[PDB]
Amino acid sequence: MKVRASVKRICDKCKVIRRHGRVYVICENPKHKQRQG
Amino acid sequence: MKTYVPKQVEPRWVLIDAEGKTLGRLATKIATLLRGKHRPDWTPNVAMGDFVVVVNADKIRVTGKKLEQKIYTRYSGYPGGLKKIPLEKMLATHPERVLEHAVKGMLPKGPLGRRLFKRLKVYAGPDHPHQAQRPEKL
Amino acid sequence: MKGILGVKVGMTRIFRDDRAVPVTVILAGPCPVVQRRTPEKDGYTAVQLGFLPQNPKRVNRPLKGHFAKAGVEPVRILREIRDFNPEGDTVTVEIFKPGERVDVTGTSKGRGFAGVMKRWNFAGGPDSHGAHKIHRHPGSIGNRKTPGRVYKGKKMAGHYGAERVTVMNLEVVDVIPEENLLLVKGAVPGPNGGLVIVRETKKA
Amino acid sequence: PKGVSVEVAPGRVKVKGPKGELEVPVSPEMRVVVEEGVVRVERPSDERRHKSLHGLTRTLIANAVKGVSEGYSKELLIKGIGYRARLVGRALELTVGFSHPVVVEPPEGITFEVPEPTRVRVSGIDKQKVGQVAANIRAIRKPSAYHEKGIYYAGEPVR
RNA sequence: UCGAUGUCGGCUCGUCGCAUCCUGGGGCUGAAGAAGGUCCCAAGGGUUGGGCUGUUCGCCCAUUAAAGCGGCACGCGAGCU
RNA sequence: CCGCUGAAAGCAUCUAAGCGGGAAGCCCGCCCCAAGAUGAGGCCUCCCACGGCGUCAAGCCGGUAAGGACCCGGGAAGACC
Ligand SMILES: [Mg+2]
Ligand SMILES: [Mg+2]
Ligand SMILES: [Mg+2]
Ligand SMILES: [Mg+2]
Ligand SMILES: [Mg+2]
Ligand SMILES: [Mg+2]
Ligand SMILES: [Mg+2]
Ligand SMILES: [Mg+2]
Ligand SMILES: [Mg+2]
Ligand SMILES: [Mg+2]
Ligand SMILES: [Mg+2]
Ligand SMILES: [Mg+2]
Ligand SMILES: [Mg+2]
Ligand SMILES: [Mg+2]
Ligand SMILES: [Mg+2]
Ligand SMILES: [Mg+2]
Ligand SMILES: [Mg+2]
Ligand SMILES: [Mg+2]
Ligand SMILES: [Mg+2]
Ligand SMILES: [Zn+2]
């Protein structure tokens, strides 16, 4: 998914970085691109 | 009952070089200067006191982040528009007015408040093409 | 920036050998400049222009012969061109060359109290099925108690026309500087005899 | 860094040497020093408003002096069918799949050196603008559109 | 509020919200391309003509890029029907 | 939404210092009104005594000009103005 309210870390490689308040998740596979919005 | 009153004293043409001060924190010095809340002659219905000339506008620094945060909505045009102006735009075009809008809320609301706002002569400084007369109160 | 003063004198379709281009005829006469509004005393870089010079001593206190060919001031009165800067004198039509677009700004034909269904193209009401005294009325002009007022930009009955209007991108199709005409393709606003300023293009 | 000639102002460290001058700002904190080319940059203040600026400027001054000692070569590979990047003047024209083959201008300090129509590199006295105008050239065509089109630095094609 | 707040719908005029139906961006896609799906920004502009019903709403017809969901006293009768 | 540079955390990360792209969206650009913008602007031009009543060119009038009205002929201006 893309924009959740609760953002998990469903991988081991999903970094949980935070770019201007929004708790993103980046990865190497793109399906894990969470946003917390 | 006694008699206390002031008389029409020749004004105080204070300059305020405002290179550093945050607006608001400056402007409540300016409004307290604009009303006669600093001379002990103060009747509240004469608009005595200072004719403040705050100069050296934009680079009025503001607080923590108010880069496109502080919204100057004020102008309801009149059918569909509350038109919004952030402080970046305000300091960009006619800077000149963030101080005017800062003191126009700290002055009172009646006709004495409106007369007192005409005393404040904001410029974008220096060289306010106005003066030879400057008790530059800092 | 390519400005002139002129008179809309009529319309005529002429032919560019293949079609019928329906031009009007602007009498963009030789307009003497009367004051070059400089940007260091005004801020404009504009130029006041003139028109027809036969004003038999109706020239009161704007007598103002401070230009070397002032051509005593027209009651076909002064207007501006806002970003102009000529180079010689009495700018004629040769500034315009056939094939360049112009914006023509003129006072439109006023229609008085041309009330609504004419001013704002309202759909009026039904001419039948029922009552009758609403055939050309605006109908509703708001909502009930909230807002409980008419919005201030409301379209209603008013003084239609007689305000300056600018048609942008009219092709200059020809000039006839044998009699100093200017021919643009389309509908220059105003009466056939009214005043139109003709400016440079705001294409680019 | 032997050939550099670094100088300090309050609002700016300023680096020089065998290529040119770079003018790197900093927060003026700690009244930081210099003894040689690479520096012990200073902080005693353990809070995060300074504990990261130290380290940031430790890498930034190093990137500046390395840019004057040739911090240059970011290599853009072009993959697939011959989307040739060829230099004309200094603004490079690369013909990637378009009706309008793209001419990319440099910012002042950067030149696009073109070895082949298979690869280009972007050189300049920086890392900031160098990565930026490798990035605009990669944004001419973001690569991985069901593979082998687009341009790459050294990235990894997976299906 | 019953010493009255006229009441459904349509017409007319609108204006606003965004929780968008197009249009402009974009992310993923079980995204070859064309499509599309879903989600994020995004009201600036739109948002058709009909048949039936008093109808709002629907069912259709022919389109459309889309034929938005609402609010504004289920907007609007000192404007009308 | 994607970046570049890069720490906090020797790796990376669009971000905390910075800086870039980027939406019909926002501001300005385009068109129109607009100095009643008491903040009442600017520019060009034209006209300029004191004789008269004081704690004085006198705050009040009478003759002044530059001009403006009144009126009349009108008008693709317009209900009147
Ligand atoms: Mg005074
Ligand atoms: Mg003075
Ligand atoms: Mg008329
Ligand atoms: Mg009708
Ligand atoms: Mg009736
Ligand atoms: Mg009847
Ligand atoms: Mg009742
Ligand atoms: Mg009652
Ligand atoms: Mg595919
Ligand atoms: Mg949204
Ligand atoms: Mg809408
Ligand atoms: Mg509605
Ligand atoms: Mg109702
Ligand atoms: Mg009724
Ligand atoms: Mg009613
Ligand atoms: Mg790196
Ligand atoms: Mg940028
Ligand atoms: Mg605007
Ligand atoms: Mg005025
Ligand atoms: Zn993952």
D116: nearest Cα among D99, D144, D145, D94: D94
Cα B28 to the center of its chain, rounded Å: 8
Q: How far apart are the first and last CA of chain A?
A: 12
Could you give the angle at the alpha carbon of D143 between the alpha carbons of D140 and D148, nearest 5°? 125
Q: Where are the alpha helices (DSSP H) in chain B?
A: 27-34, 87-92, 98-106, 111-117
> Do residues C67 and C33 touch, judged by C-beta distance below 8 A?
yes
- Tell me whether strands D7-8 and D12-15 are parallel, antiparallel or unpaired: antiparallel
Distance CA B112, CA B105 (A): 13
- Tell me whether strands C182-185 and C21-26 are parallel, antiparallel or unpaired: antiparallel
Neighboring chain B residues of C153 at a CB cutoff of 8 Å = 78-80
Distance CA C149, CA C151 (A): 6
CA distances from D137 to B51, D72, D93, D143 (A): 58, 16, 11, 11
Q: Answer yes or no: is C134 CB < 7 A from strand E.
A: yes
Q: Answer yes or no: is C58 CB < 7 A from strand F.
A: no
Q: How far is B100 from chain C (nearest CA, A)?
A: 25
Q: List all nucleotides in chain E with at least one atom under 7 A from a protein Cβ.
A: 11-17, 26-29, 31-33, 38-41, 44, 72-73, 75-77, 79-81
C85: nearest Cα among C140, C132, C45: C45
| Environment class of B57 (CB within 10 Å of its CB; exposed 0-12, middle 13-18, buried 19+) | buried
Distance CA D116, CA D118 (A): 5
Tokens standing for residue C118: 């004419």
CB pairs under 8 A between B and C: 8
Between B27-34 and B98-106, two packed helices, what is the crossing angle to 10 degrees? 60
> Do residues B59 and B21 touch, judged by C-beta distance below 8 A?
no
Neighboring chain B residues of C152 at a CB cutoff of 8 Å = 78-79
**Given 3-state DSSP classes, what are the helix, strand and coil percentages for chain D, each rounded to the nearest 5?**
25, 25, 55
Cα-to-centroid distance, B131 and ligand 2 (Å): 4
CA distances from C61 to C43, C56, C73 (A): 25, 14, 10
Query: Quick one: resolution in A?
Result: 3.7
Q: Answer yes or no: is C94 CB < 7 A from strand F.
A: no
> Do residues C13 and C22 touch, judged by C-beta distance below 8 A?
yes
- Sequence-distant (6+) residues with CB within 8 A of A12 are none
The H-or-E segment that residue D135 falls in is: helix D128-140
* Signed CA dihedral, D138, D140, D145, D151: sign only: negative
> Do residues C165 and C92 touch, judged by C-beta distance below 8 A?
no
Chain C interface test: which of B75, B76, B78 (most C C-beta within 10 Å): B78
Determine the length of chain D. Answer: 159
Q: Which of residues 91-150 of D touch strand F (CB under 7 A)?
A: 127-132, 134-136, 139, 142
Distance CA D88, CA D95 (A): 13
Distance CA B43, CA B117 (A): 17
Neighboring chain C residues of B79 at a CB cutoff of 8 Å = 151-154
Read out DSSP for B47-63? Answer: --SB--EEE--S----S
- Sequence-distant (6+) residues with CB within 8 A of B131 are B13, B15, B53
- Sequence-distant (6+) residues with CB within 8 A of D13 are D6, D7, D24, D25, D26, D57, D61, D64
User: Which residues on chain B place their C-beta less than 8 Å from a C-beta of chain C?
Assistant: 78-80
Q: Answer yes or no: is B96 CB < 7 A from strand F.
A: yes
Neighboring chain B residues of C154 at a CB cutoff of 8 Å = 79
Q: Answer yes or no: is C137 CB < 7 A from strand E.
A: yes
Cα-to-centroid distance, A21 and ligand 20 (Å): 21
Which region, left, alpha or beta, applies to residue D67 given φ > 0 means left and ψ of -120 to 50 means alpha? alpha
